[PDB]
Structure formats: C-alpha cells, structure tokens
C-alpha cells in the first residue's frame, strides 16, 4: 500500500544542543496541502518538485519557514492520477534526496529551473534525469509504480535526511519528487486527451527555531 | 564451472575504498629568482574520475585519510636534502613565498623528512563542520554559486625544501591517499554520461551517450 | 636491545595495515547523528531490481529502449523478445545496477531473477511464454522446444507482473519471450502495449577480486 | 622432518630474470614477468611428481645495476591480478590504478619482499589437464594464472639506468594430493609433455652382461 | 581380490552450493556396460581408454552426459582375459588420473588419439606411456597384475578425483585405463593366436545437473 | 625505545622463517574440498614396489629390459641373473621409485626388499635359488658357496612370486639368482619365460640433507 | 552393442557350463 522511505517513521530531534525551545506547530500547519493537477499527455516528459520549496509562501507553512532560520520536518506524499479503463501507461514516482539539476550543453541552470516553486518544472532529458544519471537505475530511491491497469495512487512517507539536524528552509532543499512517464500514454480516438495528476502533501513532525521580525 | 560461494568480506563498504592510489601530483622547480620554490595542493578526492565515480555512488560520507608523499628528482638520483611538508588547516592562510612567515607558524603541523628517507606518512582526521561530507548539495551558500558546499574543506600541504641559498633541485611530489573508517549513508545510481567539469554535474545534452551497446535485432540474443 | 632488519624494511607497499602518525592530536571531530540509509556493503545494492534495456537496437534513441514492444499485428508463436543472462558482459545488463557494480569485482557467482510487468490497457487480454534455457544450449527456434524447458505461462488478465528465477550463473543462459495467444482488445482500445524488464541478484550472489571499471 | 611435503618445496630459488634498460626513446623502460613455476627444469621436475597442488607464494626482488654501483633511485614493483590488463608503457594509466598493489622501494634498500595468496578459481592448481577449454588447444588450463609484476623506475625525465631484476619464489603451505612417476625423457616444450620419440633415452645406464654385478 | 583406488568407496556430493537439485539416476544407468574384446597378440603393444569418454553416446549414460553440463561419478572397472593353461604372459592394468597424451617427434596429437571413444587406441611407445613418463614406476597408480598362470580378472573401484566437484563429461576426461603387456605372449604352434580382453564398467554414484533441450 | 642493530641486518638469507607482507588483504581463497590421495611426505612414495631394470644390457631396446630371461637350454647352477643392491647409484635401481627420489637427499640408510615374480606357463615347473651376500663380500662364484648365505629356495609350481628382505643398506650387497633345477615343460608348451624384478624400501628407511638431482 | 543395452547375460565357458535366461510374460513375439 504505502512505501516507507528507508524504514524510519520520522520523529522529533533527540536532545540536541542550542535548544534549551523550538516550536512544534499543531494541525494548523499539518493539514493536507493539495497542489495543482498537471496534465499528462502523449508527448509529456516528466515533472519534478523541490521540497520544502513547494510549500514556501503557501499558507501557515509559508509564514513559518520564511520567518525561521532553523527547520526540520518530514513529509507524506500522495500522488494520484485519474484515468479510465481505456487509457494505458506507467509513471515512476521516486524521491531523490539532494537532487541537483546539472545544466546542459558542454552553462549553469537558472533559479527557476532548480527552484521551480509550486508549479514544478518539466524535464528536458528524462533518460538521464537532467543530471547525467540514468533512469534505468533510479529504483534505488523509495519508489512506487503507478500502472494504469493496476492502481492509481502512490504513497511515500519521507523522513528528514540531512547531515545537519537543522538547516534553513529557503536556501537548502532536502529532496525532490520526480514523476516520469516511462511508458507513454496511448488512447483510442474519442477519449480524454489529458489525464490529471494531483499531489497531496501533509507535513508530519515540523519544527521551527528562532523567530524574525 | 564455479560451484561454491565467494567471500563476503571483500564487498563491504570499507574494503571498496580500502587501498591507496594516486590523488595528486605537484612540482617545485627550485632555483633562481623567476621560479617560486614551493608547491601547494588543495585536498580534494574529486580530481581523478576513478575515485570520483566511486564516491558519487553515495551522498554522505565520513572517513579519515592518511597520506604518503613519494618525492623523486627529475632524473632519480636523490642526494640528501631536507624537505618540509606543512599542513594548513581549513581557516588558515596559505604561504605566499618560500621565505614567508607562514612557514614558521607553530599551528601548521609540518614534517621534516630528507629525500633519502622512506616516504613521510601522516594521517588527517575528519575535518568537517557537519557530521558527514556532502558531495551533492541542493542549495545556495547565501549562476556559479549553485551547488557549492564549503563543509568539504580539508587543507593544503605546501611542499618546500629547507635550505638557505636556493638549491637547484627540480622535484616532483606524488600524493597517495588511503581512506579509513568509511561510512556511506544513502546510495544513488552510478553516472553514465562523461564528465564535463570538476565541481558540477554537467553532461553535454547535445550528445546523450547510451548505457548499453547496440545489437542488430531484439529477437537475437547474440551480441 | 638487539634487533635485525629483515628484507622489506623501507618499502611503501600499498594495501597495508600500518598506522600513521596523527597530524592533529587533541582534535575532536563533530559527533555523528542518525542519518537514514547506512549502506554497510555493496552486496545489498545489487539485489535492488532496476530496469533492463532489452530493446537496445539502433533506432531506439531515448526512453523507448527500456520498453519491449507488444503489438496486435503479431500472430501466435512469434518471439516477442530474447536476451542473454550476463550480468557483467555487454548487453541489456549494462544499464542495470547488478551489472555496473560488477565491472569491478573480477569474479562473480550466484542466482538472479528477472521481473516482467505489462503496461497495457485494463481491457486487454493475452498470454506470454517466458522460457529460460540452460547456459549450455542456444536459444530455442520454436515455441514447442521452448515449452519443454523452464517455461512460465504468464497471462495478462489475471496477473500484470511475473518473475522468473535464474539459477546459478557464472562468468551464458538465454531467456526468451514467446506469444502464446495473440493480443486481444475490445473496440475503441489501442492495439499496442509495452513490457518493461527488470532484474537483480539473489541472496547467494557473491563477488571476488577487485578491479577498476572500464567506464 | 626433512622428507615431508612442506620441506621438499621449502627453500627459495631463482624463478625468473627480467631487464629494464631505461633511457631514450627506442627503449621501453618497463619489464613484465608472467608468474609461472614451470620455467626452470629443476622446479618443473619436482612439481610434475604430483597433479594437484595448493600453496602460497612469497617473492623477493634482487635488483642490481649493470656494474653494481647502486645510487638511490625509486622503483615500483606493481602486481596485476588475473583479469586485469598489463601496462603498455612506462607512462601509461595502468601504473596509477589503485587496485594494482605496488611497492615503492629504492635501489639502496634491502630487497622488497611481498606475499601472494592462493589465486585459483578451483581448489588446487592442476599441472595435468586432460581436456579442452571449450591442436594447440589441448591440455591448457586457465585456472593457473597468478599475475605479473611490471618493474618500473619512478622518475620524470628518463634516467639512464640498465637494471636487472631477479625474482626468488618461496613455496609456503604446500599440499600435494595424487602422485605420479618422475619424468625420464628430456623436455621439448614448456607447456606440453612432448618427448621426441625418434630417440628414447633409457632410464638405466648399460653394463656388459646380466651376470656381472660390477657396473 | 579387488583393488580400491586410494581407499575411498565413492559417495555423493556433500552440501555443495548451487544445488538447492541434481538428479540421482537409478539402475537404468548403473547397469553393466560391456565394451568390445581386444585381441592380444605377440606383437601387441597396449591399449588405453578415457573415462567417461567410453560411455558417451552409449545407452542411458550417453543421453544424460550429453544433455547435462555438470557431472560427477565413480566407476567400477573389471578387466578379464580368457586364456588356456598353455598360454603365458602378464598384463599391467592401472588407472591414471589426468592421463595426458603427449605428442611425438620433436606436433600435437589429434582428437581421436586423445579421445578415442569406445574403441580405445593403442600405444606407440608403451615404455614411456606415450607421455615421457616411464612404465617402470607406473605402479604408483591403483594397479593389479593379470598373470596368466595365477589369475585372469582384475577389479579396480575408482572414486571421483578432481579439484572441482562438478565438471562437464564431454570436454574433461578424469582418468584413463591402461592395459599394457609387460611380458609378451608366447604359445606353442597349434594354440589360439589371439586372446580376447573384455572390460565391464558399472557406474556407482552418478550425478547430473542442469538439463538441455 | 632504544635499540641496537646486531650484525646481519639487511641480508636476504634463503631458507629463512621471516614472514612477508600480504599483497591482497581481505582476499578469501576458494575453500578446499576432499580430493583423494594427499601425499603427506615423500617417505611413503619410496615404499611402493616398482619394476627394476635388471636386464640393462646393450641389445635390449624397449620393454625387454624390465624382464630377466629364463630359458630351458640352460643347465643347473648357471647364474640366471645378478645385480647389486644400490638404491641411489647407477644400475638397475635408477629406473625405480626408491632410487629416483634419492638422487636428492644426500644420505640414506634403511632396509629394503626385492620381490620377484614368474611369468611362465601354468604347466611349467622348476626351482630357483635367491641368495643375498653381505656388502663386505663379492658375488658368489658357485651355487654351493651361495647356498651357505641367506638363500631362498623358490620353486615355480607352488609359488609364482617370492620376496627377499635386504637388511640395512647404506650409501654394497649383491643379490644373485641361480638355477637349482632346470626348466621343465610338457610337450606343446614354450620353453622360454621371464622374471620381472621389483623393489622398494621398508618402514625404517630414512633420508638426510637435501640436494638437487642430476637428472 | 545394441543387444548389450537390453537384457543381456555375459555367459562364459570356463566358470559355468550352463546358463538360463527367464523370458517374462509371452502371449499369443520376442527374439532371443
């Protein structure tokens, strides 16, 4: 049913120094944030979303992660696409920690290419994941297939993976959520051309330390 | 032909990074006024593409390092001249000349070994402010500023011959690094595209090389 | 005390266990924290199933070489695909995880498995025959002489994914993919689909003498 | 204690001599040596008394110049394990591969001694193989490979030495299983039992008559 | 009575890897295979048979050893010659593991010289065993004399002797069975000139692994 | 700690017990299996009886020099054969197993035995006298002066093989073979036969200081 | 050789002077 990233069930920080202190916010921030639905077509090529960049400037999490210079949280990711029984295809939904966009053409990528926002950007070369690293071996990461004749939803629960127990939520993005159609979408003439893909994010154990302004 | 099972001691994460190989070569060329007389070397393991491809299979690594300096002359005949292998820790300034005051700072641990001696071996601990070295950083330190992590600095060495009146040697230091107590946390796929730069994952998208060599048809297993 | 120096004193022999002098005594590193992951050995990387470029032809050019094409114009018994089982030689097993960590590690011996999954519509129905030949024999020329081996009759309506275990390769064994029944579709449903092949090593897979890779 | 199977193969003798002749462009500057014990007919006749043997080996490299006067020049004794490529030049990239364990010992030092373990895919070395690896292919067993050494002087700008390496092998922990008679006919080739049947030499020197014991 | 090769009573493989698995065939393959009878004359010079080459393409053992790429078996060899009380001579019946035919004339031997088949070939130089190795010391091997005034039969029971517990029965031949007249055959005029030598092979503990076609 | 270097530091002395540095740490060889045979010492090779070239004359040329000829034209008391007991010197004991592993091993001392067997027809009947003289004396010139020693009256009808034990040779002793009774045959039976001689060492045979062989 | 692969009996003359072979279950053909 659910994929559990590295078998952890994320928790709070144990007994760290410089915190006696950090606020543990309630379900006002731990609700279900539903992003936009991306239309997956025949010539579509994939998408990626940076975390926690997709929940900056959005709701209570935007007002906390912009006015705090420490941050630690784990997420619950729920990707679901709504297709009929006459469409076909497959999606690869993986979670890549420290997902670095490379830059192409023998030339560094822009700000909106690596930090796309809520509207996550699209791949240019999904075969090499836009990082010179092949999709053929991209099943090392916590993944789940969305095959349109078997299932529609994929649930991945990601803990906090970092070498430092507290960083800033604006500069550093911990992981990325790729959704790449490995097998393309085919349909007979008359069906719906675009199939939406909706994503729901619920933060689990968010912490914030040190308040501004 | 093989019926039995091999050993599981040789596949471990500490034996995969076990042996010491070449990691950097510098040159002194002492003598005269137009020549410098010293040679520094920033410690990095991403210099040669054989250790770079092995260490970019993982994101977080934590290790010690011990070094060995094999110095010969230009021809090979080694007369006894006393050398100095200093060590500038991260946060300390590098030397500016062969007679500068950074050679006499007592907080830079230097090693005085002649040319005729066996090579000077010394060990360097874990020197990061974090708890693991990061080789992939998705952030900014605040175009060319993306993906730079200053928590990977280890130091220099600044080889110098100890003399007074400008001996005419032309030396060549070879640095051999051994990785000890290696711990690697999260894995990632091995790179298929050839390297373009030293610090960046750029891959020249105008020609995407494939990860499997071609065959005639899908129905013939002979390749 | 008296002492004698045996041959081999002043050599620097790499792959040694002699300790070195610490250059910063009294230095205490940063204490480690709990990071998820913690790969203890490379042998638990080569048992993760990764996609296998079976369609490594010339005209593929992209993500269309991870996929084995299945059509409805093909009749019964017509050999959908075939590929050897060689994790370490040149072929489909060059894009997988088990086949790239053994371009190191000169010798290897163990069991594997190859997992197929079908990527057609929910309405489509058919069958496939998945036969593995031993490494002494060549690939079968007929479906009937492939039926007499280690076949698996895999259909499309009941199961969407099947797996076959290859016993004890060593440094070859050909696994084929035959049409048992043609690809049956209702009206207003596309007639082409794809199979993507996966593959990893079993628990008794081991490795021997180290070697640098050939990129 | 002196007739046992471990003391019969105990002492270390000469097993191979190579030459460098560094200097210039027309000269190579390196010298490889395939590890085999069937080079000299005194160790060959002792080890072909048995079929299956299992042993360790430790080596010692006695290098002098052409005259003898040894100025301190740093050398490199590498080791290419079976399955790894040999070097192609004195400045090739096989000298910097970290999986080839090399030894850096000067000329003025005592000789560089190092030990090599049991390096066969089988559980014993075979010196008589009645089969084919699939005329000149009969009786070849690739399970006896041990490696090379590839002596090289470490320098930058072509020192003019002319060296000579002598390799001394000691056999340790020797186990021999099935015996066989000692060869009477003289050797013709290095890897084959050919014996030149046009003249069969006898195994006992002649005497005058059968009735006189004086010989 | 019987000669037991190295004092073993051959058995099955103990607990080896890559077999959970190999088939242990019944007495349909472990019957008595009687080869041809070779006529021993005055100017005869010896014979040799390679194992298991003499039982390839012969009966049930031929259909198993050609369609299996692993093999392990031990044999029971029974050499018997039928002579009267007016003939005389002696035979040396030995079992040579890894018996390599050399090649003569200062020039490698052919395929039918080293792998003769059921009709085993004859020696050219029996004094050096066609391998540069003298017959004078050939009593190291498990042997038995057939002296025509004492006995007629010789029974040798040979286990599986190899550095690898499973090989192929087609490429590698484990041992050879030599029969060499050390003392020649003499008879008065009127007796039977040729004396036959018949051989009976019974496999003991044959194993086969991995089936073809 | 203080230390002083005694004379003999930097020497490479062969036949030493100093260990060498392992060149591949972490390498695990292939585990050994049960192979029949397992020669533990060379002293159990020199107690296997092997054939002895007593008829090492000039005109022999082949397998006819392993055989001692016995005829029916010879009368009684006419010295069928004679040969010394010297396992290590030049003669009949150069083709045997005990005499070829002691072209090594400079000194040897122990007991031996020499086994004869007869290769005539079943109908034939005769006798032989097998006498051994001590190493101080020469060979006997008569049968009567050979009868007064360590004789064995060996006949042909009862026994087909006899053995005589030679006590305590050292680095000579002559064993002869006399006609006691002429070779008796019925009609239509050949009148010539052969004896082949064998020989090995006893349990109290030992060896001393090693030496390379003289081929 | 193709008769050796059946129900043979190697009968010699020196040891035994008479041998017997049992034919299993004829019915109203089998060649010996």
Tokens of D185: 């006919």
Q: Quick check: E36 and E118 in contact, CB under 8 A?
A: yes
Phi and psi dihedrals of C64, rounded to 5? -80, 10
Residue F70: give the domain boundaries: 1-215
Closest CA–CA distance from residue E213 to any residue of chain F (Å): 32
Chains F and E: 3 or more CB pairs within 8 Å of each other: yes
- This PDB structure is determined at a resolution in Å of 3.4
Mutation test of the interface with chain C: which of D107, D109, D166, choosing the one with the most C Cβ atoms within 10 A? Answer: D109
Q: Do E82 and G12 touch (CB under 8 A)?
A: yes
Q: Quick check: D113 and F21 in contact, CB under 8 A?
A: yes
Q: Do B139 and A173 touch (CB under 8 A)?
A: yes
Tokens of D125: 């070395």
Number of residues assigned to chain B: 223
Which chain D residues have a beta carbon less than 8 Å from that of C212? Answer: 84, 97-99
Nearest CB to D155 within list B20, B22, B75: B75
Please check whether residue B5 touches E, CB under 8 A.
yes
Tokens of F79: 């010295």
**How far apart are the C-alpha atoms of E103 and D192, rounded to whole Å?**
8
| Number of domains into which chain F is organized | 1
Number of residues assigned to chain G: 32
Q: Do D110 and C5 touch (CB under 8 A)?
A: yes
Q: Do F63 and E182 touch (CB under 8 A)?
A: yes
Those chains having 3 or more beta-carbon pairs within 8 angstroms of chain A are B, C
CB neighbours (10 Å) of residue E178? 24
**How far apart are the C-alpha atoms of D36 and D145, rounded to whole Å?**
8
Mutation test of the interface with chain D: which of F10, F30, F80, F82, choosing the one with the most D Cβ atoms within 10 A? Answer: F30
Contacting F with CB below 8 Å, chain B residues are 4, 6-7, 9-10, 15, 18
Residue pairs spanning C and F at CB distance below 8 A: 40
CB neighbours (10 Å) of residue A125? 20
Nearest one of C101, C79, C75, C76 to C88, comparing CA atoms: C101
Q: Do A140 and C45 touch (CB under 8 A)?
A: yes
Query: If you write DSSP's letter for every residue of E8-38 in order, what string do you get?
Result: -------S-TT----B---TTTSS-EE-PPE
The DSSP symbol for A36 reads P
Q: For residue D159, what is the nearest residue in chain B, using CA coordinates?
A: B75
Q: Quick check: B62 and B126 in contact, CB under 8 A?
A: yes
Q: Quick check: F140 and F149 in contact, CB under 8 A?
A: yes
Tell how far CA E197 is from the center of its chain.
Answer: 13
Nearest CB to E132 within list D131, D185, D198: D185
- Max distance between CA atoms of chain F, in angstroms, equals 97
CB neighbours (10 Å) of residue E111? 10
Coil vs helix vs strand at F180: strand
State how beta strands D125-126 and D52-64 pair: antiparallel
Tell how far CA F192 is from the center of its chain.
Answer: 26
Mutation test of the interface with chain F: which of E137, E143, E166, choosing the one with the most F Cβ atoms within 10 A? Answer: E137
Q: Quick check: B83 and B113 in contact, CB under 8 A?
A: yes
Q: Where chain G is broken, by preceding residue (C–N > 2.5 Å)?
A: 28
**How far apart are the C-alpha atoms of A198 and A80, rounded to whole Å?**
6
Which chain E residues have a beta carbon less than 8 Å from that of F63? Answer: 126-127, 135, 182
Alpha-helical segments (H) within F74-178: 144-147
Alpha-helical segments (H) within B19-167: 49-55
Q: Do A136 and C36 touch (CB under 8 A)?
A: no
Q: Do F9 and C13 touch (CB under 8 A)?
A: no
Please check whether residue B80 touches D, CB under 8 A.
no
Please check whether residue B4 touches E, CB under 8 A.
yes
Sign of CA dihedral C51, C57, C58, C59: negative
Q: Quick check: C69 and B167 in contact, CB under 8 A?
A: no
Closest CA–CA distance from residue C204 to any residue of chain E (Å): 9
Identify the helix (H) or strand (E) that includes residue C3.
strand C2-3
Closest CA–CA distance from residue E117 to any residue of chain G (Å): 14
Cis link prior to E212 (omega < 30° from 0)?
Answer: no
Alpha-helical segments (H) within chain E: 59-65, 111-114
**How far apart are the C-alpha atoms of E3 and E154, rounded to whole Å?**
8
* Cα distances (Å, whole numbers) of residue B93 to B65, B108, C25, D36: 22, 10, 21, 55
**How far apart are the C-alpha atoms of C75 and F74, rounded to whole Å?**
93
Which chain E residues have a beta carbon less than 8 Å from that of C109? Answer: 18
Contacts of E61 (CB under 8 A, 6+ apart): E29, E33, E52, E55, E203, E206
Tokens of F10: 């930097």
Which residue ranges make up each domain of chain E?
1-213
Q: Do F84 and D50 touch (CB under 8 A)?
A: no
Q: Do C21 and B121 touch (CB under 8 A)?
A: yes
Q: Quick check: A12 and A205 in contact, CB under 8 A?
A: yes
The DSSP symbol for E23 reads B
Report the structure determination method.
Answer: cryo-EM
Q: Quick check: C2 and D101 in contact, CB under 8 A?
A: no
Tokens of D97: 């591969």
**How far apart are the C-alpha atoms of B154 and B165, rounded to whole Å?**
32
**How far apart are the C-alpha atoms of D144 and E111, rounded to whole Å?**
24
Chains D and G: 3 or more CB pairs within 8 Å of each other: no
Tell how far CA F210 is from the center of its chain.
Answer: 20
Tell how far CA F73 is from the center of its chain.
Answer: 30
Instruction: Enumerate domains of chain D plus CATH numbers.
Output: 1-215 (2.60.120.20)
Residue pairs spanning A and B at CB distance below 8 A: 100
- Max distance between CA atoms of chain C, in angstroms, equals 97
The DSSP symbol for D42 reads H
Q: Quick check: A179 and A20 in contact, CB under 8 A?
A: no
Residue pairs spanning B and C at CB distance below 8 A: 169
Q: Do B10 and F28 touch (CB under 8 A)?
A: yes
Closest CA–CA distance from residue A183 to any residue of chain B (Å): 18
Question: Residues 120-159, chain B: which have Cβ within 8 Å of D?
Answer: none
Q: Do E200 and G12 touch (CB under 8 A)?
A: no
Q: Quick check: A208 and A22 in contact, CB under 8 A?
A: yes
**How far apart are the C-alpha atoms of G21 and G32, rounded to whole Å?**
9
**How far apart are the C-alpha atoms of F134 and F166, rounded to whole Å?**
9
CATH number at residue F56: 2.60.120.20
Q: Quick check: E117 and D161 in contact, CB under 8 A?
A: no
Cis link prior to A52 (omega < 30° from 0)?
Answer: yes
CATH numeric code, E1-213 = 2.60.120.20
Chains F and C: 3 or more CB pairs within 8 Å of each other: yes
Which chain B residues have a beta carbon less than 8 Å from that of C42? Answer: 11-13, 16
Sign of CA dihedral E169, E175, E177, E181: positive
State how beta strands E75-81 and F67-70 pair: unpaired
Which chain C residues have a beta carbon less than 8 Å from that of D121? Answer: 107
């Amino acid at each position: 049913n659910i994929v559990l990233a590295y078998g952890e069930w994320p928790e709070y920080c144990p007994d760290t120094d410089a915190t006696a202190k950090p606020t543990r916010p309630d379900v006002s921030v731990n609700r279900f944030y539903t992003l936009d639905s991306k239309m997956w077509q025949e010539n579509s090529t994939g998408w990626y979303w940076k975390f926690p960049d997709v929940l900056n400037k959005t709701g209570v999490f935007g007002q906390n992660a912009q006015f705090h210079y420490l941050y630690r949280s784990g997420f619950c990711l729920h990707v679901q696409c709504n297709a009929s029984k006459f469409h076909q295809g497959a999606l690869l939904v993986a979670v890549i920690p420290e997902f670095v966009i490379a830059g192409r053409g023998s030339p560094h990528p822009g700000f909106t290419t690596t930090f796309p926002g809520t509207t996550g950007a699209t791949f240019y070369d999904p075969y090499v994941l836009d990082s010179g690293v092949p999709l053929s071996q991209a099943l090392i990461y916590p993944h789940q297939w969305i095959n349109l004749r078997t299932n529609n939803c994929a649930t991945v629960i990601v803990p906090y993976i970092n070498a430092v127990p507290f960083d800033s939520a604006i500069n550093h993005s911990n992981f990325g959520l790729i959704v790449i159609p490995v097998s393309p979408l085919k349909y007979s003439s008359g069906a719906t051309t675009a199939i939406p893909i909706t994503i729901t994010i619920a933060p689990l154990n968010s912490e914030f330390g040190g308040l501004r302004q | 032909c093989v019926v039995n099972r091999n050993g599981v001691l040789e596949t471990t994460i500490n034996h995969f990074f076990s042996r010491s190989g070449l990691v950097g070569v510098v040159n002194l060329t002492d003598g005269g006024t137009d020549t410098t007389g010293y040679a520094t070397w920033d410690i990095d393991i991403m210099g040669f593409v054989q250790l770079r491809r092995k260490c970019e299979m993982f994101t977080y690594m934590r290790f010690n390092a011990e070094f060995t300096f094999v110095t010969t002359t230009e021809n090979g005949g080694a007369r006894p001249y006393m050398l100095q292998y200093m060590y500038v820790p991260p946060g300390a300034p590098k030397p500016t000349g062969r007679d500068a005051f950074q050679w006499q700072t007592a907080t830079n641990p230097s090693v005085f070994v002649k040319l005729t001696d066996p090579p000077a071996q010394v060990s360097v601990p874990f020197m990061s402010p974090a708890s693991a070295y990061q080789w992939f950083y998705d952030g900014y330190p605040t175009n060319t500023t993306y993906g730079l992590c200053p928590n990977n600095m280890m130091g220099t060495f600044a080889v110098r011959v100890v003399s007074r009146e400008a001996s005419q040697l032309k030396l060549q230091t070879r640095v051999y690094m051994k990785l000890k107590h290696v711990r690697a946390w999260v894995p990632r796929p091995i790179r298929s595209q050839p390297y373009l730069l030293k610090n960046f994952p750029n891959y020249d998208s105008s020609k995407i090389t494939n990860s499997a060599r071609d065959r005639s048809s899908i129905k013939q297993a002979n390749m | 005390i008296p002492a004698e120096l045996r041959p081999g004193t002043n050599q620097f022999l790499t792959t040694d266990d002699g300790t070195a002098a610490p250059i910063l005594p009294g230095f205490t590193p940063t204490p480690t924290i709990h990071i998820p992951g913690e790969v203890h050995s490379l042998l638990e990387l080569c048992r993760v199933e990764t996609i296998l470029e079976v369609n490594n032809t010339t005209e593929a050019t992209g993500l269309t070489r991870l996929l084995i094409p299945v059509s409805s114009q093909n009749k019964a018994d017509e050999l959908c695909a075939a590929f050897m089982v060689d994790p370490g030689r040149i072929g489909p097993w060059q894009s997988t995880l088990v086949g790239q960590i053994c371009r190191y590690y000169t010798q290897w011996s163990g069991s594997l498995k190859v997992t197929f999954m079908f990527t057609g519509s929910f309405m489509a129905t058919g069958k496939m025959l998945v036969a593995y030949s031993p490494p002494g024999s060549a690939q079968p020329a007929n479906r009937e002489t492939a039926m007499l081996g280690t076949h698996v009759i895999w259909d499309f309506g009941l199961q969407s994914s099947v797996s076959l275990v290859i016993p004890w390769i060593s440094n070859a064994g050909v696994v084929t993919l035959w049409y048992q029944t043609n690809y049956v579709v209702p009206p207003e449903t596309p007639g082409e689909a794809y199979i993507i092949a996966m593959g990893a090593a079993q628990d008794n897979f081991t490795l021997k003498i180290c070697k640098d890779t050939d990129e």
